[PDB]
Amino acid sequence: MQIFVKTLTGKTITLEVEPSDTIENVKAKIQDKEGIPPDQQRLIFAGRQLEDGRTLSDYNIQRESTLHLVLRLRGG
Amino acid sequence: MQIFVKTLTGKTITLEVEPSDTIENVKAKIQDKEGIPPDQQRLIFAGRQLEDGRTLSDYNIQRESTLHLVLRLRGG
Amino acid sequence: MQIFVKTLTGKTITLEVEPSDTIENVKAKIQDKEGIPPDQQRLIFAGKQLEDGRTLSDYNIQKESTLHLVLR
Amino acid sequence: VQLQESGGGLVQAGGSLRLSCAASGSIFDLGVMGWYRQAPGKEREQVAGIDYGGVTNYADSVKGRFTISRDNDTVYLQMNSLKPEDTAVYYCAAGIVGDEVGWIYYLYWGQGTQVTVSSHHHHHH
Ligand SMILES: [Zn+2]
């Protein structure tokens, strides 16, 4: 299945994933697409932070769903 | 149809809406439920800012979807 | 995280909180540390009153931030 | 609706630059604003941050040298005593905090402005 990763700056990424893909496996694809390290990605879906160790199906992420990518930087 | 609204770390709340409801209409319902005025609300879905004039169907917001609410924070 | 609560007299107290702790949880911590009931407490950040049901991250209150306690 | 940096350029070691971050769509009302930089071969790293209350914080490598400030819809980064190690593309970003401590989720970021700091021998003996 294919999903989308969207930034509020305008970037739209189309990824082929599986419902059992883990979040960290998705961030590895985003790094290939955008060059942002996984530790510096934060994905948001349904108003929730997508966490390591969980699958896309754990968050009810379905076909052609859109994940919100924000930049996660150590600060403060 | 019933949708959900939450901040990233807050409680999720339920809205009864129609696909033809405008984003301004949705923000007014959030004020009725949660007391947050519309001028202090930012709604995000599918990595897109929900603009007040558009409808929920303009963003393909469907049954049981969850909107990401972000507060508008200003000094004083 | 550690956050600071500043009274009108200038007293700073430190609380150990979580980002998703509610303002309600913060007023309860102030009571356990200073003996001030949450009913008398009014928490302010950047000049805004903080609502009981909201979390610290809802108001973008980072670590080592300072809330202002005003007694009601 | 975007952020957009300006003010970068080539400067000698010890020189000064002031970066500007212009925001549209009232996006600074997200509450948390920050500057970060990335040099070639290195990772992104936040250098300074400011929240909507005006409270600032800085990385250790820029304390006493950099100053972040705000004028409504513009965030600045006054850079003094610039070193060659400060050479990078500088980005301004706005966002929120989540359930984590010490990490910031930047929703928006600009295209960046290039800051190059070069040693220039002072030939006035
Ligand atoms: Zn010489």
Automatic annotation (TrEMBL), chain C:
Residues 1-72 form the Ubiquitin-like domain. It is a peripheral membrane protein. The keyword Transmembrane does not apply. The keyword Cytoplasm applies. It comes from the Eukaryota. Keywords: ADP-ribosylation, Cytoplasm, Isopeptide bond, Membrane, Mitochondrion, Mitochondrion outer membrane, Nucleus, Ubl conjugation. One of its GO terms (cellular component) is nucleus. It is found in: Cytoplasm; Mitochondrion outer membrane; Nucleus. Belongs to the ubiquitin family. This is Ubiquitin B. It comes from Homo sapiens. The lineage of its organism: Eukaryota, Metazoa, Chordata, Craniata, Vertebrata. The gene is UBB. The chain holds residues 1 to 72 of 93 of the full protein.
